[PDB]
């Protein structure tokens, strides 16, 4: 029900070892020349890097 003891700084920090973001999966486009998510449409060019729209 309730914490028996307060959690120490060390223990709190150990618990948060896995609470983090991963870097996004991105890469530079050829036509744009700027970063884009893989398998997404590149807004800089304004279409899908390969398939023209």
């Amino acid at each position: 029900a309730v914490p028996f003891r307060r959690t120490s700084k060390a223990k709190k920090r150990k618990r948060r070892t896995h609470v983090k973001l991963q870097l996004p999966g991105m890469n530079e486009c050829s036509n744009c020349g700027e970063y884009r998510l893989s398998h997404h449409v590149c807004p800089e060019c304004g279409q899908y890097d390969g398939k023209d729209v």
Partner: protein, 122 residues
């Protein structure tokens, strides 16, 4: 099949609404989960369209929404979503066996991080 955080009747309503939107506008932006369900339902409506006969028209009519796409002017008469499906959309896919839709991944929505996509006829 996907339950889209909706009861059975709510989900049928949603699928009919989006199906009609994609037939009317030919390109809509929605969530990935919705798009992956819509492709199944829209490609079956286009199949009915390709079949073309009265029985298929009435099967489509049971699903498609009674929406006016446009007014053509001959007198001026409206064009209904069902008419567009059977007179405009269906014929353009006469020689194409399946795969009437495509889903382009767009990116996450600001307010809920929902992964948004374009689904379009082609």
């Amino acid at each position: 099949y996907r339950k889209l955080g909706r009861t059975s009747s709510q989900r049928k309503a949603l699928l009919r609404d989006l199906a009609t939107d994609l037939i009317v506008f030919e390109r809509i932006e929605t969530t990935e989960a919705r798009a992956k369900e819509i492709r199944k339902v829209v490609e079956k409506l286009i199949t009915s369209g390709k079949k073309g006969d009265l029985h298929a028209r009435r099967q489509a009519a049971a699903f498609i929404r009674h929406e006016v796409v446009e007014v053509v002017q001959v007198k001026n008469r409206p064009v209904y979503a069902l008419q567009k499906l059977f007179d405009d959309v269906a014929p353009r896919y006469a020689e194409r066996q399946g795969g009437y839709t495509r889903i382009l991944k767009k990116g996450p929505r600001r307010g809920d991080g929902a992964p948004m996509v374009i689904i379009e006829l082609v």
